[PDB]
């Protein structure tokens, strides 16, 4: 981030917690009570269901 | 591994080759972020002149 005139250096972790996390934290699914995810699929207009 | 295996079947597979290019030596440049900020040189200036 910057190098202090003192001689020290400031790194991104020195000011933040960096981790791999979801783009958003709005949706959370559960299948029969246990952690889950998945896809809700919409049928395209006119396309056959089966 | 698969190309070598297919080479053990000249009675079944012939002319089994990759349809692409082979890896080649590249010249990597490592810009030291510290010494750059320590000389008042912008990374943007560096990556543009280069």
Curated annotation (Swiss-Prot), chain B:
What is stated as this protein's family in its record? Belongs to the resistance-nodulation-cell division (RND) (TC 2.A.6) family.
Name the chain's protein: Multidrug efflux pump subunit AcrB
Q: Where in the cell is it found?
A: Cell inner membrane
Cite the record's note on assembly. Homotrimer, with large domains that extend into the periplasm, interacts with AcrA and TolC. AcrA may be required to stably link this protein and TolC. Interacts with AcrZ. Part of the AcrA-AcrB-AcrZ-TolC efflux pump.
Q: Which residues form a coiled coil?
A: none
Q: What induces it?
A: Positively regulated by MarA, Rob and SoxS transcriptional regulators (at protein level).
**Main role?**
AcrA-AcrB-AcrZ-TolC is a drug efflux protein complex with broad substrate specificity that uses the proton motive force to export substrates.
Gene deletion effect? Loss of susceptibility to contact-dependent growth inhibition (CDI); inhibiting cells still contact the target.
> What species is given as this protein's source?
Escherichia coli (strain K12)
